[PDB]
Amino acid sequence: MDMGISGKVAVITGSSSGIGLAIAEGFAKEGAHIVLVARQVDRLHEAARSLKEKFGVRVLEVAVDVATPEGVDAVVESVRSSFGGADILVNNAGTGSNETIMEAADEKWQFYWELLVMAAVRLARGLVPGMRARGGGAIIHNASICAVQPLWYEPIYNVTKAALMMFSKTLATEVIKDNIRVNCINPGLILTPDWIKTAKELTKDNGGDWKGYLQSVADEHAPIKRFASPEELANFFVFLCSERATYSVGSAYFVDGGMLKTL
Amino acid sequence: MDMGISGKVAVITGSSSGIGLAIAEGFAKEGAHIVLVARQVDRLHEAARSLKEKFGVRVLEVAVDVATPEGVDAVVESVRSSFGGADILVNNAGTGSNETIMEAADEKWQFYWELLVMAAVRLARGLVPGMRARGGGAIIHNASICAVQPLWYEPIYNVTKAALMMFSKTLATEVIKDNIRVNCINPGLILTPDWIKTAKELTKDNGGDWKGYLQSVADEHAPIKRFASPEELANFFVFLCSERATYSVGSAYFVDGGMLKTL
Amino acid sequence: MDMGISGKVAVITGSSSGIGLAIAEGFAKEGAHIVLVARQVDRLHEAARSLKEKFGVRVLEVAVDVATPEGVDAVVESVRSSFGGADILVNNAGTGSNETIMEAADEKWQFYWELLVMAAVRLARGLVPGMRARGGGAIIHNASICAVQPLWYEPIYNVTKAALMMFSKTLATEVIKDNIRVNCINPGLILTPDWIKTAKELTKDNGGDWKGYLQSVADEHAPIKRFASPEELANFFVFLCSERATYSVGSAYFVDGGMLKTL
Amino acid sequence: MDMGISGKVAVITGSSSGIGLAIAEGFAKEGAHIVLVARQVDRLHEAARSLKEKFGVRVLEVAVDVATPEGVDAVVESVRSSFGGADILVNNAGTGSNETIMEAADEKWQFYWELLVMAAVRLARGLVPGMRARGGGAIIHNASICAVQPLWYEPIYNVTKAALMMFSKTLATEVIKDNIRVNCINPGLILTPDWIKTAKELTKDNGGDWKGYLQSVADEHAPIKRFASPEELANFFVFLCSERATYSVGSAYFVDGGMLKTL
């Protein structure tokens, strides 16, 4: 199936590793030029080198903190300078949380609000004008199954991912007039490096069977009884930003191996 | 994007016309063998001829009423004897309703229950064993935006589409162990022959501006301010049934141009 | 808080025991006249005697099967004959299921469709005209948390309760015209006789710790870690049908001790 | 129906006018002592006197901005000094928004985050320990129908109300162990002073029929074709915080006259 995105310019936040890098590789495979954004310069360089080598597309690296307005401004200026504008934006930079409401400091709430919600707000303000001028575009917000089905250990993440899912919907209705299609994807358990790190930490004192820990997580939460690979998730992002998904507007698509317990 | 559908056997109910026919074309383009199912065989012949001649695929026609156990039984036996079993099943046969609860006959409720729900129940019972023996497969239920956001004029359709959406989710958890992935797609406004007929009928005594009537429907319901084509919807069915959507289990995916008013 | 229902006529289906009887007690305590409906004649008569003597209200028994058109007809005519019409209707008659989709007979699907959905359809057609003529009323559908969050062992019940929840919503928008307010309540774990019977059956060969079995069900499903009493659930039904809940229209109210895992 | 809240201490944020004032009057009618909280001292002083005079309960005035940590701390300290602790908390202080995403300033996003979300976080942190020590309690978050069904003109309000609805759910699971029951209410169109002010502003140049403007808003959005009164809505708050609603945990209850378009 032709995706029709060859030569389009795709900005992916948090794309030096995990889901965001698999998304970038997915778009590059379809011939899209890539703007990679993350904090660490080294991983960003490898990601870009590998994408250009494997796929022969143009890749721009932007090494900034998208949780800050300065960082978002830098992404916008870099896109402008190298490409003029973006055709596709994926908001993916983020991380899990771990607290109780009774104990967490206000600054932690603020941190996740800036990272998960305000990055998406600021990136839309900053890149929508360019997208409009190019004749339209696609914007995806990678929220989480937790945006509707909260995990007990991470209330701050649950609340801010819920906010992001609503933001996606409100943005979709605002910019569809510009031929810009905005949607949300809500992943379930996706095997990424922090899950492995966590699995090791949590099994340090009971035998170190970190793969067993992960399997028990999957057994508890997902009828499919396994984690997804980032590549398998990335396919959905590529499809949703393609010329084949032109009636998808303001929707939330769960990719979760059965983990969502309700309709 | 490679779909990995070539040589797979896809059974599409209600595929002589409209959305089901567009789905069959979408699968044929990707090299799938097609089982077309509908009541009126003239349209089945025409559809099957076109698919064979345009796409070079094998097409089996089954002219039966899927709202009956006997019709379903014939579909199952036609598939087993011609192909061994199915890889893909798309439950699509259906039609809208038009009544009030206060006036509708019990028999009309029964008709939609048989057509929209029992067809899917009976096809799963009949086809899942063959699918299991083949190593897995994909089942999609084409319900509707009305399965969650009911349209005032068709309460029976709303209730039975809602039931179909829940059926999809229950079947998903029962059969995922067999590597059979079940999902639901809920379309919004899709321009099919019956919409054009209704438009012409509702405007016959006021100017015959049927295109104007359809535009007013789109303006009322969809932020994108147009109907989708069957072809644009069909892309989503092909993708969900492909090797690229292997983590989608028990999900409901709206394809509705913004029509869904909630998260 | 004054409920304003003294002297109102409340029809409760399935009210010779369990939740339905508790709802009838709740209404009787607020001075409503009661129409009790169930199949077993003596059980129903004794439930009626107890209400009448404990609460001093009028109680009318209709001993019929509400899954049949003839049973519903009898209810409507008994209400018309004794009271003129109803002010309140609670659709409650029902029972759980237990099957797989692969094994269940078509006849079992039909039974639950008639009992859970058509009973509500037929009672609305039969009773709404009298309620209209009385100046308005309240209709509640007792569905289940399973109408949105399906339990693995009972797919038929999940599908038909989902259908009922949608019916509630469609009826709500049809009759609000007439000052009839329709809503749905979705209960979680409610300790009724069949739960106790099941706990005793499933523990007969491992120590008979039936209370232990029920506690394990509560621990698995509900954050509150207990079942509700029917009486505690009944309060919500009485409130929703009162003069105090006059803006509740087309809503679904979960009363579930935290069991719903999503927003 | 006895609510069983006589002598309980209820803290209602934003309770000098509109919905919050109506909720305070509803709890006072049931014998509850009241903590009234709002910014404008004169209105608050007046409302407190009136309540004390009319219902003969204790009324504590705390004139602070609950969007600030200092304001929340002053509520917590005043409650501690006068009453020891709270039995009931209603998070109600808030206001609508009006902007586009493309035009709104970062500071406006922050303002609503602090007002609608952080107020509830901070008040929960501050009051839950006193509630736990008193043996349990009830907390309600007054979010909005917009938390799930966004209104086009107020994206910031929609996003922050959605965040609040998720916060309510996450808090509910964290504190049910303390016998503290947390729920969300999502009102539809409630006739409050700002609706009247808006209706006048918007009809200033087209005839001044502000009541007609409000009727058109209700006709557009609500099947019941009217606004609710704040007193109508307040009944639901009082009921949910009563001894009759003891199995309501982590639920969201819409009170919206049919405005929600989906299940």
Ligand SMILES: NC(=O)C1=CN([C@@H]2O[C@H](COP(=O)(O)OP(=O)(O)OC[C@H]3O[C@@H](n4cnc5c(N)ncnc54)[C@H](OP(=O)(O)O)[C@@H]3O)[C@@H](O)[C@H]2O)C=CC1
């Ligand atoms: N993994 C999972 O199970 C699921 C993940 N998600 C969502 O997927 C998204 C990505 O997660 P995942 O791939 O697991 O995470 P990883 O930690 O593997 O990757 C996160 C990426 O984001 C970057 N990043 C983090 N913070 C910032 C920042 N402030 N500014 C710029 N870049 C940043 C990281 O690079 P660097 O540190 O150099 O900045 C890295 O490239 C997140 O939004 C997460 O919520 C949703 C559901 C499930």
Ligand SMILES: NC(=O)C1=CN([C@@H]2O[C@H](COP(=O)(O)OP(=O)(O)OC[C@H]3O[C@@H](n4cnc5c(N)ncnc54)[C@H](OP(=O)(O)O)[C@@H]3O)[C@@H](O)[C@H]2O)C=CC1
């Ligand atoms: N069009 C739209 O805007 C939307 C449609 N849908 C759903 O899409 C599905 C397809 O509808 P659409 O393409 O619009 O309609 P069409 O009328 O164009 O296609 C319906 C197909 O179903 C077949 N069919 C109907 N009843 C039976 C039956 N008892 N047994 C076997 N085949 C049957 C019809 O052929 P025959 O009559 O010869 O049997 C025809 O092939 C339906 O389920 C509909 O509810 C959902 C949302 C929106």
Ligand SMILES: NC(=O)C1=CN([C@@H]2O[C@H](COP(=O)(O)OP(=O)(O)OC[C@H]3O[C@@H](n4cnc5c(N)ncnc54)[C@H](OP(=O)(O)O)[C@@H]3O)[C@@H](O)[C@H]2O)C=CC1
């Ligand atoms: N208990 C629970 O945990 C939950 C229950 N529910 C729902 O609550 C409702 C009541 O259930 P519950 O109280 O537990 O069940 P019970 O079996 O304890 O009570 C059912 C009542 O309905 C009557 N009844 C059953 N079938 C019919 C029929 N065909 N016609 C007329 N009356 C009938 C029964 O009497 P008779 O047999 O004599 O006809 C009895 O009076 C059901 O709809 C159930 O699905 C929802 C969520 C949870």
Ligand SMILES: NC(=O)C1=CN([C@@H]2O[C@H](COP(=O)(O)OP(=O)(O)OC[C@H]3O[C@@H](n4cnc5c(N)ncnc54)[C@H](OP(=O)(O)O)[C@@H]3O)[C@@H](O)[C@H]2O)C=CC1
């Ligand atoms: N009216 C409606 O149709 C709907 C309203 N709601 C929600 O209901 C809640 C009440 O709104 P409503 O009654 O309409 O509005 P009003 O403006 O009439 O009342 C708001 C109350 O909150 C107070 N308040 C506002 N900001 C603060 C603050 N920062 N700190 C302390 N008190 C504050 C106000 O007093 P002061 O200005 O002096 O501080 C006032 O007493 C809001 O959360 C709103 O979003 C939800 C759905 C619909």
Ligand SMILES: O=C(CO)[C@@H](O)[C@H](O)[C@@H](O)CO
């Ligand atoms: O979104 C999820 C799980 O789906 C969260 O648990 C994590 O924060 C995720 O980012 C993996 O670390």
Ligand SMILES: O=C(CO)[C@@H](O)[C@H](O)[C@@H](O)CO
């Ligand atoms: O859009 C979706 C995904 O299907 C949502 O509707 C979810 O089902 C949930 O947030 C509410 O139904």
Ligand SMILES: O=C(CO)[C@@H](O)[C@H](O)[C@@H](O)CO
């Ligand atoms: O699902 C829809 C449109 O959203 C139904 O109302 C129609 O009946 C459709 O099946 C074709 O008319």
Ligand SMILES: O=C(CO)[C@@H](O)[C@H](O)[C@@H](O)CO
């Ligand atoms: O029907 C009954 C009675 O056993 C319930 O237990 C259902 O399984 C379900 O509604 C529980 O919420």
Ligand SMILES: O=C(CO)[C@@H](O)[C@H](O)[C@@H](O)CO
């Ligand atoms: O919640 C609503 C209406 O449903 C918002 O439009 C406003 O903020 C309201 O609170 C003020 O009029």
Ligand SMILES: OC[C@@]1(O)OC[C@H](O)[C@@H](O)[C@@H]1O
């Ligand atoms: O997962 C099994 C399978 O047959 O399901 C249907 C897919 O089209 C096909 O690619 C896949 O191999």
Ligand SMILES: OC[C@@]1(O)OC[C@H](O)[C@@H](O)[C@@H]1O
């Ligand atoms: O005693 C219960 C009852 O149903 O018994 C039968 C009587 O006819 C009726 O009046 C009465 O309420």
Ligand SMILES: OC[C@@]1(O)OC[C@H](O)[C@@H](O)[C@@H]1O
């Ligand atoms: O709204 C009509 C009515 O009969 O509905 C049922 C309520 O119990 C009653 O108080 C009310 O007046």
Ligand SMILES: OC[C@@]1(O)OC[C@H](O)[C@@H](O)[C@@H]1O
């Ligand atoms: O529980 C969240 C919610 O919005 O889910 C959908 C239901 O309509 C409603 O009852 C419920 O409040």
